[PDB]
């Protein structure tokens, strides 16, 4: 009566109390092993004997694990609990073709970081205002698709249709997509836009040549240190004016999941039930509260999201606003054709900024993109 759990690196101690509570309530023992979330899929394929009963993963890999038969639909009991307690965006993270396969525990989104000695709060709600009054820095020469890929969805185009599950639904090859490429190209002559490399985002923020930039919670500490805690502002993504339309700038949402792999239980339904119970425990309000407090995990649970501790933390509050609605975030699609998206979107965004494609080529390149990705 032992089940194996894979938890994110560093996290084991954070979860000790949660696990003890589960152990005391279920009478199962839990073997807890740290293991990198992004590698869970590879690890399972390589050695299914050693595979954990319960493991953390990023939702962007959930579609693959479903399609290989590794993760099965959760029991209806848990489906109801997850839908009730999670944000709608988090649930979309946990679902694939209409079924729930995992338990959200966390969310992540990029935000706008700015220097309060260079920009007032009032002036960071609009990209046009930011670059009129100060500077915005981005890595446009070597485009980051995670960062600026969502511009295409910001203007009302989709990545694999509205639900992110139609392999033929990506529709950038139109005037709105072309207008995204135009805006990219225009940033080269926008006097408030500063062309960055990955390795100088933070240092140019520190030296004051970049007043603002977009990144995730992983850069929060470095931003703080670059200009001083008291000078660091955090805000939601601004509006941006593309093709003469002012629209909300979107980012991707990442949803952090626990899932159950039934295979190591070999038909033992008592143990499978225990595995779902563990996942439920790991991702309930109490655990998410503890995970925010100990490891600054931004909760997927609506109730913890609105807690004073979380709402008083400007980074967490901002990530939550971004994850609160599809007005701000696109939940990263799960289809394997995302592979093409990463490669081709980066190249086209780069080429538009660098002038390796011209305006008269924007539409044909985007139409070709739409064809390529639909394979």
Residue numbers in the entry: 39 to 413
Task: Give the text the authors published on this PDB structure.
SPs0871 is a maltodextrin-binding protein that is part of the maltodextrin transport system. Shelburne et al. previously showed that the knockout of the maltodextrin-binding protein gene did not suppress streptococcal growth in a nutrient-rich medium and that the protein played an essential role in bacterial growth in human saliva. Among the virulence factors in GAS that can be targeted, proteins involved in complex carbohydrate catabolism have been implicated in pathogen infectivity. To develop novel treatment methods that circumvent the generation of antibiotic resistance, we used virtual screening followed by several biophysical-based screening methods to identify antibacterial compounds that target SPs0871, which is a maltodextrin-binding protein that is involved in carbohydrate catabolism in GAS.
The crystal structure of SPs0871 in the absence of a ligand was determined at 2.20 Å. Three aromatic residues critical for ligand binding (Y184, W256, and W380) lined one side of the binding pocket, similar to the structure of other maltodextrin-binding proteins. The 6 of 16 residues in MalE1 that were identified in previous studies as being involved in ligand interactions are conserved in SPs0871. Given that other maltodextrin-binding proteins have been reported to adopt a closed conformation upon sugar binding, SPs0871 is likely to undergo a similar conformational change. Maltodextrin-binding proteins are thought to exist in the unbound conformation without ligands, and ligand binding drives the protein into the sugar-bound form. We first performed virtual screening for the two-state conformation of SPs0871. Using both conformations allowed us to assess whether potential ligands induce conformational changes in SPs0871 upon binding. Virtual screening with the two conformations followed by in vitro screening yielded a hit compound (95,186) that competed with the ligand and was derived from the hit library for the unbound form. Therefore, it is likely that 95,186 favorably binds to the unbound form. When we performed additional docking calculations using the Glide docking program (Schrodinger, New York, NY, USA) to identify hotspot residues for the compound binding, E146 and K294 were predicted to form hydrogen bonds and W256 was predicted to form van der Waals interactions during compound binding.
